[PDB]
Amino acid sequence: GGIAIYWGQNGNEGTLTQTCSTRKYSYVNIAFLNKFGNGQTPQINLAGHCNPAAGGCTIVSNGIRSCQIQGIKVMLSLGGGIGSYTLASQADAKNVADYLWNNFLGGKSSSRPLGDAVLDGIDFAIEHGSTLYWDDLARYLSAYSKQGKKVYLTAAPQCPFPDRYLGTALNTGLFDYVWVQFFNNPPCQYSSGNINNIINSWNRWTTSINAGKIFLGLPAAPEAAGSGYVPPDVLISRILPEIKKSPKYGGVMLWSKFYDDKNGYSSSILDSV
Numbered sequence: 548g549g550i551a552i553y554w555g556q557n558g559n560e561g562t563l564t565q566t567c568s569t570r571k572y573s574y575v576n577i578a579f580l581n582k583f584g585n586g587q588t589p590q591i592n593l594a595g596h597c598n599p600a601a602g603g604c605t606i607v608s609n610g611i612r613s614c615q616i617q618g619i620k621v622m623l624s625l626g627g628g629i630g631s632y633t634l635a636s637q638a639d640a641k642n643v644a645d646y647l648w649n650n651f652l653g654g655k656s657s658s659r660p661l662g663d664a665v666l667d668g669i670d671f672a673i674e675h676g677s678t679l680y681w682d683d684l685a686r687y688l689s690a691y692s693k694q695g696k697k698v699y700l701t702a703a704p705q706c707p708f709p710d711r712y713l714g715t716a717l718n719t720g721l722f723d724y725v726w727v728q729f730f731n732n733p734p735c736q737y738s739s740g741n742i743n744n745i746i747n748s749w750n751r752w753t754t755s756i757n758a759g760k761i762f763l764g765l766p767a768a769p770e771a772a773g774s775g776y777v778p779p780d781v782l783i784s785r786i787l788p789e790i791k792k793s794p795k796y797g798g799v800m801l802w803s804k805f806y807d808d809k810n811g812y813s814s815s816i817l818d819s820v
């Protein structure tokens with residue numbers, strides 16, 4: 548399989564171009580568009596990388612294209628752990644979809660936040676706020692694929708099944724890639740000497756939802772999350788041998804680029820994924 552990586556939440560993790568030239572990642576999620584819905588003007592947060600004001604982040608388009616020519620798919624991730632993002636109604640879902648289409652996808656906008664590059668899709672990283680209309684957002688975005696270029700839909704639900712916020716959206720069967728987060732959740736994450744909880748969770752996800760491929764989402768380092776970190780050796784010799792048997796296995800997802808560099812996680816597991 549392949550490795551999906553989240554980039555954008557630490558200015559010291561390197562440019563998007565550097566990230567893709569590592570040749571270790573197959574998918575890159577740009578985090579995050581953490582503010583939107585309920586009449587708010589959408590705003591992206593890329594930590595210390597760039598300031599979106601006055602097209603300060605349009606420089607990212609160079610990295611996007613650099614990744615895409617290498618066959619790497621780049622998605623814009625909605626939500627995250629911090630933000631006042633939400634959807635007040637179905638009309639709000641349509642408004643946000645149209646916004647995303649014109650500013651990040653194949654639409655037209657005189658003020659595209661990340662430049663003129665066209666992203667491959669939208670990543671759903673919703674973990675708080677409203678639990679409604681996310682399935683509508685997925686439908687409206689998917690409808691735009693009928694105009695020619697496919698709009699990929701990916702999601703990053705928490706491992707507890709079913710996901711309180713993305714459960715309904717995932718039931719639509721419109722998502723291509725789903726990287727479940729097996730951390731910050733005691734009941735379905737790894738615990739010293741115990742892989743039962745994570746394996747049991749994996750079997751529930753791979754047999755319950757209709758998606759293209761499902762990935763094992765993990766923290767790239769002990770400091771990347773509150774809990775759930777899995778030592779490389781344990782992942783390789785005890786977890787991967789089991790989950791790779793599933794026909795829906797897509798690979799591994801890691802949070803995040805910054806911590807991956809410091810811990811050298813992807814470098815240690817790449818060939819086994």
Ligand SMILES: CC(=O)N[C@@H]1[C@@H](O)[C@H](O[C@@H]2O[C@H](CO)[C@@H](O[C@@H]3O[C@H](CO)[C@@H](O[C@@H]4O[C@H](CO)[C@@H](O)[C@H](O)[C@H]4NC(C)=O)[C@H](O)[C@H]3NC(C)=O)[C@H](O)[C@H]2NC(C)=O)[C@@H](CO)O[C@H]1O
Nearest residue numbers: 556557558581592594595627628629672703770771772773
């Ligand atoms: C898929 C998913 O949902 N992943 C979850 C992760 O979101 C979560 O990790 C934490 O994520 C938040 C964002 O949601 C992130 O917060 C960012 O923190 C950085 C560092 O402090 C801030 O960067 C600074 O921004 C200011 C102004 O924007 C700059 O002036 C300054 O230069 C920046 N500093 C640097 C070094 O770049 C970001 O502003 C801030 N983002 C937001 C939206 O406020 C946390 O740091 C993430 N925490 C960790 C440990 O990575 C993860 C937690 O385990 O859980 C996932 O599920």
